[PDB]
């Protein structure tokens, strides 16, 4: 029997290179071909005959064949690049496919942008208030917000919303809304919105008196 | 399955056939989680009724003695008119109510109506960075979906719609979040435009910064 | 109007006497009659006429009615009697059903009692073992088990089972099953099962040693 | 050689009887005895000759010597009885002393009382008020309050007090106190102080209304 | 530490002097030309030579004081010398004694909890007895608390029978020695 | 009237304004004063200075402080003093953050002459990273591991400020002869999720 080998897994990140191997027992003398499956789609050739790539793949993809080791090299990875590659050959009339391997490209962390608006003039005429804090651009889903009052912690009046990331992205955007009524948002002069996550390095808070806006 | 805004409902509860009956029939309604409440009374052997005050003007109670069921009418439902109701038999002249029938479950769906835009203040200290955040914000609709478009269409770039989110009392609330320089907040003007099919609501709010 | 008053809560411990009471306007004249309603489900008659009392009622079920409250006196109070109790009364040609009362039992936490079984001979000659942890009668629901190879924190391989709370007691059952393979199980000396759980003043841990006995 | 066994460590509530076995071959047949060392300290006699006990020791202290196993028990358990036991015992010209034994001595785990003062009527017109929520005896030190006015959770403004266990008991006791500024008492209707502490199955908390109805 | 209410002296072109409270920032109060006054401490800094004399310290008088000098006309100062650190404690206040309203809800336990709060008073410590020592039963005395001023603080309670409570004289007894001070204040249910 | 705080990173310019009517008019003077320290005067005369990284000017009604390639030894609390009596303004704190930084880790199998002694030692190294705070995990075959592992940390260099972690984890011989596969598991700000590094027991 025969049996071609390649890595379990591999890890890089966006900008780099990654490298994979199909290796085996004299493969060198032997036409291979990579297959590329993202998740739940059919298996689409990205490469045949080792080097001689298909119409329409990007240039980025690039491989090669010789001794035992053939390799698939791929230059400035992306959000995109992320699929099962497989390995082909033929041998003793008998196809042979390659142990899947995975390749994941790890997305940069980057800081949430934070900002706090206060409640319009006219909302006001009509019995509610209703302070926003937005959390903008941020990749680490993982975020904590909480709205303290005149420095007192409140909770079970406020709601979440989201959005998913940007195709050509990463980061999501949050924002949180803490519903009041009048009579209550007419005292408490200090309004605060603290926020904890990654790349912080300490939580940010950001307010606004009451008064003089 | 939910009955429209302004129709009626029909509960059904068993009648004497036209003989004796020994039992005087009612009906009670217990909103999700307050209590319950009277609505109406009959005496099969007398077919007189009785109507609670609250209810006086939107309750009838009929009975059939051919099919042996009765059943109350309630007519113009309202969001507050989404409850369970219950159908008990007491003895003839004692007045406590015993076997309790099943429950049966009626639900409403609000109203439909426009939204209502206010806007957020920008930025009012001086962020020298250049990213100054606007926004207007859409509340109090229903029902599903509103469209937010800014300067006619015309900026798409930076623009975030975060999904709409049920409120508490039933409506529905969506936001809007443009991020631009801060050198170009005194010199463009900034306009939402919301559009709400079903009411037909088509309603433009100018955002600047609030004067100090 | 005509308005009765019931207090929003009430709480007791199993095995005392629960006041409930029904607060009107010369309420002594009137006839009223109390309600159980359990969640879910259509309230059942369990008083009327102050004191007298149905067929298919238990002994300990009691009321009064004087001067401007009715009181239903519970006794014995147990895991079944938890549920809302309303109060009526006929006025003005007009009914008028009182406020709803929550009546809630509070539990009293049992610690667990946690045996391990080794794998059976003739189990490990069928090529398997399978090693079990039983934690039976014990509260609240809560409860982390954390197996260990020769002080080696096992991650996965591990079956969780919970059966349904016992209404007289108020006590659940928990199963935890480690299987292994026949050689991993002959490899090692040591096996134990770490219980952490409310009730416990420290973790507990049921170890044998294997081939010993 | 010889070799004497014990059981590692031994724990008991107070107020019952624990037994620690020295087990050895041909053990019984011989006189044994036994040392109580408490740690730091140099060790103790309480046992010589099976049974036999010395000047100084209580009553409590008695011990059996039979097959091949010799009892150690211990009547009427406390804190005072912490420390390593030692059993002796004499062959072939050669003493041969066995492994340590510990005894643990903890107390039952106990449920806090709790209870909530308003605050004077005599403080107001000194323009402060002070809301103290206290905690009655519970063995188990660590416990957590959380005052929350008008359901919003607060912090910054409350201190902590703690006693000493009485002499014949292991019970603390906690007081804890809220200061507020004369204004700030005027409005939020809602008072409450909650608790969480091994031995209850649920947070408890105890409010107050403003109103002092 | 210095007595409340005494006079300390500090010993250092034209000389100034500085005053810098923990955490506060920097407090000015005058110059000497080998003499001029703040408006702040016009009456408690007395200027002569070079020293100058500080009297009737108070709670916030607690600072470090540097001595700065500078140019005769340059309006700058350079050379901060090394700072001297002083210390007020605060005056001796007798306590007040507020009641700690029993519960006004009967229990099924039967147990009901007192007790008097004492605050506001300095220095340590207080004694609390009830009913001039009689009742000795299940008594608590936490023990003090420094409050955020600089005073301090102490509470006292006893568990007693519920049907105790209408039926019997429950008084705090509070003694402070220091300030010569004796008061008794009853506890009993708040009317309703 | 300052700014209560400022916080910039490293290289970077920060400036710190003191604002007040007929200050532009006015001159103003700077003074640096670290923890514990007497005051320093940095600047004198809107510009005039007794390094040449602080600047400063007055004009209109803001005067700046301005500082250029901050680094580790420029926080301080610094105030501005004006005439009009002396009149000193709240004081304003500066902070050098530095940044984050991810680890770069290594994993070395077990020496090949240890193994004749009967005993191995797999180390997995962390190289340079700012915040301390690091934490490493040591699972072979898939099962974690504690009470087996030792981690020794270095001081942050003097132009830096980057530690440096090794964790020892030392196998008895004959247990290191089972378990094919051995790993390490590190968490750490920066890393957008946890990354293992591992090696067969015998691949080369
Ligand atoms: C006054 O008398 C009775 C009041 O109940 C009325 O006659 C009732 O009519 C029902 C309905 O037709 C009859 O019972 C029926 O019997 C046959 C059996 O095949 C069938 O139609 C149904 O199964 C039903 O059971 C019956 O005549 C009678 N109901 C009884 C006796 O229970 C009558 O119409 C009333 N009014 C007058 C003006 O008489």
């Known amino acids: 029997?025969?049996?071609?080998?390649?890595?379990?897994?591999?890890?890089?990140?966006?900008?780099?290179?990654?490298?994979?191997?199909?290796?085996?027992?004299?493969?060198?003398?032997?036409?291979?071909?990579?297959?590329?499956?993202?998740?739940?789609?059919?298996?689409?050739?990205?490469?045949?005959?080792?080097?001689?790539?298909?119409?329409?793949?990007?240039?980025?993809?690039?491989?090669?064949?010789?001794?035992?080791?053939?390799?698939?090299?791929?230059?400035?990875?992306?959000?995109?690049?992320?699929?099962?590659?497989?390995?082909?050959?033929?041998?003793?009339?008998?196809?042979?496919?390659?142990?899947?391997?995975?390749?994941?490209?790890?997305?940069?962390?980057?800081?949430?942008?934070?900002?706090?608006?206060?409640?319009?003039?006219?909302?006001?005429?009509?019995?509610?208030?209703?302070?926003?804090?937005?959390?903008?651009?941020?990749?680490?889903?993982?975020?904590?917000?909480?709205?303290?009052?005149?420095?007192?912690?409140?909770?079970?009046?406020?709601?979440?919303?989201?959005?998913?990331?940007?195709?050509?992205?990463?980061?999501?955007?949050?924002?949180?809304?803490?519903?009041?009524?009048?009579?209550?948002?007419?005292?408490?002069?200090?309004?605060?919105?603290?926020?904890?996550?990654?790349?912080?390095?300490?939580?940010?808070?950001?307010?606004?008196?009451?008064?003089?806006? | 399955?939910?009955?429209?805004?302004?129709?009626?409902?029909?509960?059904?509860?068993?009648?004497?056939?036209?003989?004796?009956?020994?039992?005087?029939?009612?009906?009670?309604?217990?909103?999700?989680?307050?209590?319950?409440?009277?609505?109406?009374?009959?005496?099969?052997?007398?077919?007189?009724?009785?109507?609670?005050?609250?209810?006086?003007?939107?309750?009838?109670?009929?009975?059939?003695?051919?099919?042996?069921?009765?059943?109350?009418?309630?007519?113009?439902?309202?969001?507050?008119?989404?409850?369970?109701?219950?159908?008990?038999?007491?003895?003839?002249?004692?007045?406590?109510?015993?076997?309790?029938?099943?429950?049966?479950?009626?639900?409403?769906?609000?109203?439909?109506?426009?939204?209502?835009?206010?806007?957020?203040?920008?930025?009012?200290?001086?962020?020298?960075?250049?990213?100054?955040?606007?926004?207007?914000?859409?509340?109090?609709?229903?029902?599903?979906?509103?469209?937010?478009?800014?300067?006619?269409?015309?900026?798409?770039?930076?623009?975030?719609?975060?999904?709409?989110?049920?409120?508490?009392?039933?409506?529905?609330?969506?936001?809007?979040?443009?991020?631009?320089?801060?050198?170009?907040?005194?010199?463009?003007?900034?306009?939402?435009?919301?559009?709400?099919?079903?009411?037909?609501?088509?309603?433009?709010?100018?955002?600047?910064?609030?004067?100090? | 109007?005509?308005?009765?008053?019931?207090?929003?809560?009430?709480?007791?411990?199993?095995?005392?006497?629960?006041?409930?009471?029904?607060?009107?306007?010369?309420?002594?004249?009137?006839?009223?009659?109390?309600?159980?309603?359990?969640?879910?489900?259509?309230?059942?008659?369990?008083?009327?006429?102050?004191?007298?009392?149905?067929?298919?009622?238990?002994?300990?079920?009691?009321?009064?009615?004087?001067?401007?409250?009715?009181?239903?006196?519970?006794?014995?109070?147990?895991?079944?009697?938890?549920?809302?109790?309303?109060?009526?009364?006929?006025?003005?040609?007009?009914?008028?059903?009182?406020?709803?009362?929550?009546?809630?039992?509070?539990?009293?936490?049992?610690?667990?009692?946690?045996?391990?079984?080794?794998?059976?001979?003739?189990?490990?000659?069928?090529?398997?073992?399978?090693?079990?942890?039983?934690?039976?009668?014990?509260?609240?629901?809560?409860?982390?088990?954390?197996?260990?190879?020769?002080?080696?924190?096992?991650?996965?391989?591990?079956?969780?089972?919970?059966?349904?709370?016992?209404?007289?007691?108020?006590?659940?059952?928990?199963?935890?099953?480690?299987?292994?393979?026949?050689?991993?199980?002959?490899?090692?000396?040591?096996?134990?099962?770490?219980?952490?759980?409310?009730?416990?003043?420290?973790?507990?841990?049921?170890?044998?040693?294997?081939?010993?006995? | 050689?010889?070799?004497?066994?014990?059981?590692?460590?031994?724990?008991?509530?107070?107020?019952?009887?624990?037994?620690?076995?020295?087990?050895?071959?041909?053990?019984?047949?011989?006189?044994?005895?036994?040392?109580?060392?408490?740690?730091?300290?140099?060790?103790?006699?309480?046992?010589?000759?099976?049974?036999?006990?010395?000047?100084?020791?209580?009553?409590?202290?008695?011990?059996?010597?039979?097959?091949?196993?010799?009892?150690?028990?211990?009547?009427?358990?406390?804190?005072?009885?912490?420390?390593?036991?030692?059993?002796?015992?004499?062959?072939?010209?050669?003493?041969?002393?066995?492994?340590?034994?510990?005894?643990?001595?903890?107390?039952?785990?106990?449920?806090?009382?709790?209870?909530?003062?308003?605050?004077?009527?005599?403080?107001?017109?000194?323009?402060?008020?002070?809301?103290?929520?206290?905690?009655?005896?519970?063995?188990?030190?660590?416990?957590?309050?959380?005052?929350?006015?008008?359901?919003?959770?607060?912090?910054?403004?409350?201190?902590?007090?703690?006693?000493?266990?009485?002499?014949?008991?292991?019970?603390?006791?906690?007081?804890?106190?809220?200061?507020?500024?004369?204004?700030?008492?005027?409005?939020?209707?809602?008072?409450?102080?909650?608790?969480?502490?091994?031995?209850?199955?649920?947070?408890?908390?105890?409010?107050?209304?403003?109103?002092?109805? | 530490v210095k007595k409340p209410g005494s006079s300390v002296k500090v010993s250092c072109?034209?000389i100034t002097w500085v005053r810098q409270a923990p955490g506060q920032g920097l407090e000015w109060m005058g110059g000497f030309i080998p003499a001029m006054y703040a408006q702040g401490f016009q009456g408690r800094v007395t200027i002569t030579a070079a020293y100058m004399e500080l009297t009737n310290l108070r709670s916030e008088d607690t600072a470090v004081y540097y001595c700065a000098r500078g140019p005769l006309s340059r309006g700058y100062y350079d050379y901060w010398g090394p700072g001297t650190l002083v210390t007020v404690s605060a005056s001796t206040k007798g306590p007040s004694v507020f009641p700690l309203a029993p519960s006004s809800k009967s229990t099924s336990g039967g147990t009901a909890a007192l007790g008097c709060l004492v605050k506001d008073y300095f220095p340590e410590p207080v004694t609390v007895s009830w009913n001039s020592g009689a009742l000795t039963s299940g008594v608590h005395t936490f023990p003090a608390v420094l409050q955020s001023s600089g005073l301090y603080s102490l509470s006292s309670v006893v568990t007693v029978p519920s049907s105790s409570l209408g039926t019997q004289t429950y008084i705090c007894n509070v003694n402070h020695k220091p300030s010569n001070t004796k008061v008794d204040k009853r506890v009993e249910p708040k009317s309703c | 009237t300052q700014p209560p705080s400022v916080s910039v990173a490293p290289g970077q310019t920060a400036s710190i304004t003191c604002s007040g009517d007929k200050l532009g008019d006015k001159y103003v003077s700077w003074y640096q004063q670290r923890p514990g320290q007497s005051p320093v005067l940095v600047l004198y005369?809107?510009?005039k200075r007794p390094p040449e990284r602080f600047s400063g000017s007055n004009s209109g009604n803001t005067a700046t402080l301005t500082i250029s390639g901050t680094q580790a030894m420029d926080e301080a609390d610094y105030y501005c003093?004006?005439?009009?009596?002396?009149?000193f303004g709240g004081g304003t704190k500066l902070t050098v953050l530095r940044t984050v930084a991810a680890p770069s880790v290594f994993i070395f199998p077990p020496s090949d002459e240890q193994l004749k002694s009967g005993t191995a030692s797999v180390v997995c190294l962390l190289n340079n990273f700012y915040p301390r705070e690091a934490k490493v995990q040591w699972k072979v075959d898939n099962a974690l591991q504690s009470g087996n592992s030792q981690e020794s940390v270095t001081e942050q260099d003097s132009k830096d400020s980057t530690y440096s972690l090794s964790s020892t984890l030392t196998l008895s011989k004959a247990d290191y002869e089972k378990h094919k596969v051995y790993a390490c598991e590190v968490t750490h700000q920066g890393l957008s999720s946890p990354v293992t590094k591992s090696f067969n027991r015998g691949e080369c």
């Open positions: 005369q809107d510009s």
């Open positions: 003093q004006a005439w009009d009596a002396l009149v």
């Open positions: 072109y034209v």
